[PDB]
């Protein structure tokens, strides 16, 4: 649901 490309600085697999 979260867009992992909203902010690449946020671990997209946290």
């Amino acid at each position, epitope marked *: *649901n*979260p*867009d992992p*490309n*909203a*902010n*690449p*600085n*946020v*671990d997209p697999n*946290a």
Partner: antibody
Amino acid sequence: QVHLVQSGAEVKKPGASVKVSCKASGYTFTSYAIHWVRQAPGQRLEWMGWIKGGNGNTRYSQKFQDRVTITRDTSASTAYMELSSLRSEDTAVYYCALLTVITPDDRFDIWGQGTMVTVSS
Amino acid sequence: DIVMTQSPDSLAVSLGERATINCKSSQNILYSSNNKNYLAWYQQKPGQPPKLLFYWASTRESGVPDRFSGSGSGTDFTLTISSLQAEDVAVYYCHQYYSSPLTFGGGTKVEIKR
């Protein structure tokens, strides 16, 4: 220390363009994305776009993609935001920022000092 | 776009009293897979950029005093200052990084009564 330093205050006439620089230091420039954020008077913070220091890929707000271009120069560890076809309502403080870096190994959030841009005839 | 709405727009409490700031998101920003709320709290003093205080709704940044705490879930979130100090006067902003564009709340101005 992770640090972002922006170019100084600007004044432009309507129709012109402005280019603000953001010089990074204290971390590996190619590892993270630098965001640009507008703070207009009495208005909320508005996200403008980001660029990855490494491959230079960008993403723009569909409020600004029409007139904003973000670029970076890794050898200079600097990101740039150019806003064209300026309107007096573009008068605002413009920030660059390493927004919410959340990694297994690193977690921080660092902003440049802001750049005042006034558009006026 | 996800709209971030804060309440109240303004509040004044005496020094050492509790201050409560609310943020509401127009969409759910809790991710059931990891059970994380994709929200940050920022503190902005005049002439300064915003200073992040909380990641993931409730994780304090290093060095944030313990009187600050972030709470809430889903669409409703709260920043609480349990004992307001003179140095806490500022505008507080919530932020979602769940979807694009990144968006911010309208801000809550916090002032001191003395």
